[PDB]
Amino acid sequence: YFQGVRIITNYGDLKFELFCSQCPKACKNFLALSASGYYKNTIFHKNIKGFIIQGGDPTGTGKGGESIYGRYFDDEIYPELKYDRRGILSMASKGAKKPNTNGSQFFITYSSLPQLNGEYVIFGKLIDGFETLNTLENCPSDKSHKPIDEIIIKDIVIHSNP
């Protein structure tokens, strides 16, 4: 089952395993947006050391993005999927506060974050590119947590092992 994707950035590649069985709606959205080029030449607009790095807004402001299903789609949230390691991949939203408000924006965690458990859809985990994530974490941000130099997602591709 579970597929891999590679997020190709201007600082190197991040490889994620996606949780296909558990979170098919979140995974299909991410795959279909990725395939249609929706994430090409976009930025991570928020980067907070020891917390999260967030991108996936074609607008780059943190206000935009929509799903393949419409503006929003429903949560796939489970006790078995937790923020229990560095490199978890999730959908941004306004907290499960305003449930079922996933769009296109996503974030990657820099550590275990039990306060986020149940709050956001987790749908993958980093399996390779840990060195890339270290580099990203150390990229300076301004006071609004915006990278000073742009962190760019060139593309997100479905990875096939040779």
Side-chain angles (χ1 to χ4, degrees), residues 2-162:
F2 294 177
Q3 290 183 64
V5 295
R6 189 158 46 86
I7 301 188
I8 303 162
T9 82
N10 60 338
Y11 292 90
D13 293 1
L14 299 164
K15 197 204 281 197
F16 290 90
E17 171 192 312
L18 298 187
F19 303 143
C20 304
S21 305
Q22 291 150 289
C23 305
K25 304 184 183 183
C27 292
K28 170 103 270 220
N29 179 67
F30 188 74
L31 293 179
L33 299 178
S34 294
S36 78
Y38 193 85
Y39 293 125
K40 300 190 80 173
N41 210 24
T42 59
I43 67 164
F44 284 105
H45 63 272
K46 169 164 90 187
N47 190 193
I48 305 169
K49 187 178 174 188
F51 189 48
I52 72 167
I53 188 175
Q54 181 166 331
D57 180 353
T59 264
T61 64
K63 312 263 83 146
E66 294 198 342
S67 83
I68 69 171
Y69 312 108
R71 187 183 177 183
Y72 294 131
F73 68 96
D74 296 345
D75 299 319
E76 293 160 308
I77 287 168
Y78 311 106
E80 322 95 69
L81 293 180
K82 285 199 162 79
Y83 294 99
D84 62 8
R85 74 197 66 190
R86 167 177 185 90
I88 295 294
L89 178 65
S90 309
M91 299 300 289
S93 60
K94 228 339 91 228
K97 214 106 288 195
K98 323 289 262 161
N100 310 306
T101 48
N102 308 295
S104 70
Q105 276 180 63
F106 61 89
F107 64 93
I108 299 153
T109 64
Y110 286 125
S111 61
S112 312
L113 292 162
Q115 340 86 249
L116 304 188
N117 287 333
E119 297 294 345
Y120 303 97
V121 179
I122 293 170
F123 71 96
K125 70 176 182 190
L126 193 67
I127 53 172
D128 203 0
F130 282 93
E131 176 190 301
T132 306
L133 191 63
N134 291 343
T135 302
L136 263 19
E137 191 175 17
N138 298 316
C139 290
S141 303
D142 69 11
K143 290 267 153 41
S144 289
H145 315 289
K146 206 182 186 74
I148 279 148
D149 296 330
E150 284 184 329
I151 305 178
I152 298 160
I153 291 167
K154 296 178 169 174
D155 206 354
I156 306 191
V157 303
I158 292 29
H159 180 89
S160 302
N161 258 44

